[PDB]
């Protein structure tokens, strides 16, 4: 009597990366990158109507 | 974080190290200097003695 045991496969995935970018979600926004956010103190947008 | 705000302020820090350590070496000269009389007022004994 001649026994083994096997192993018969190994599977991995593909962890998926998605910007945010490529998305509908980014209309709904302006993005910019302001690196500086962190000594800012308060920013301010105005308006006239 | 590599933005100009970190620059600057270091340049500051920099400035403010250099100027304590420039005035601490010239208090050994002025201490030498007042440790003389000092030392000179230790062990000196009054004219009218």
Known sequence: DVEFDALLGSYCNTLSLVRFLELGLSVACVCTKFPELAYMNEGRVQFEV | ?49
């Open chain 2, 1 to 49: 974080d590599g933005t100009g705000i970190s620059l600057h302020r270091q340049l500051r820090a920099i400035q403010q190290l250099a100027r304590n350590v420039q005035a601490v070496l010239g208090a050994f000269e002025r201490g030498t200097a007042d440790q003389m009389l000092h030392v000179l007022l230790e062990k000196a004994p009054p004219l009218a003695l």
